[PDB]
Symmetry: D3
Subunit: 62 residues, 6 copies
């Protein structure tokens, strides 16, 4: 049985409602595309400071 575990890393400062909706809608997405039982779908959100991530070697804070 599928037990999806979703980790979402994104920029800090999201509203509680944005977080709430992200968890629900990401769960919907996983459920409908894979057929996983909804009760087996887990979501964790990790917020990041802009000085802790980047692309092409340049941090978002810079």
């Amino acid at each position: 049985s599928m037990m999806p575990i979703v980790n979402v890393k994104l920029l800090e400062g999201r509203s509680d409602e944005q977080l709430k909706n992200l968890v629900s809608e990401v769960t919907d997405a996983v459920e409908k595309t894979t057929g996983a039982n909804r009760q087996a779908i887990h979501v964790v959100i990790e917020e990041m400071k802009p000085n802790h991530y980047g692309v092409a070697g340049v941090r978002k804070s810079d």
Copy 2:
């Protein structure tokens, strides 16, 4: 800038078409709920092997 990175761990056995849809729909969910620019949303699917995970100390899903 937002740069969401989504990791999805799930049991091996979905088709490439299902995983294509999973990428699209997780991206839709992140874009809708956080306002992140679509071009900055990344999704990685990691496939778990049978017998390599569990809940409640047993090799089953929830």
Copy 3:
């Protein structure tokens, strides 16, 4: 050689002693079941706020 790396995500607010014991006992568990050298077993704990995770699309804070 096995080099186990363990990541434990759990609800924030654990006592320092609970954390201490978790690291030791999880290490014991990995060592005894896999035969890994104890010196090669690494544990990281990531504490989560209840508004940053959920199951079945519902956050623990809700």
Copy 4:
């Protein structure tokens, strides 16, 4: 609610029986040391390939 999620990265090559025991014993360790409800404790084992990891810049364990 607690919802521990434990990820264990370790070298490929353990038997399914050893990995079954690993799931059980990591679950026991988490339950004992944190008080988390057993039904909410999840363990995922990710197998590392030979030559795909290292310590001290060399492809060896500690």
Copy 5:
């Protein structure tokens, strides 16, 4: 196409310049050794408190 995603867990308290340089130099390392396009290389830094990690069952704080 390669889309490298790098996660660096390390002890908290790094200077902003150390972080900046880590992101740039790790990106250089990935680029030169794999041939990945620099624009596809992503780095996330997760800082850890010494009471949240250990090796051989002993936390750095202890």
Copy 6:
């Protein structure tokens, strides 16, 4: 103590020699920029499968 743990997710298809170099060079980068003792720097390479990841909702790199 520092104990950096670096995870690198990248598309399957590099040679073992390239991955050896990746481990060495990521280690060099971490050592240079943070001052971490080399013996405490760990690198794990996780290979993503084709069609198992994307950016902008499509199965392509940036």
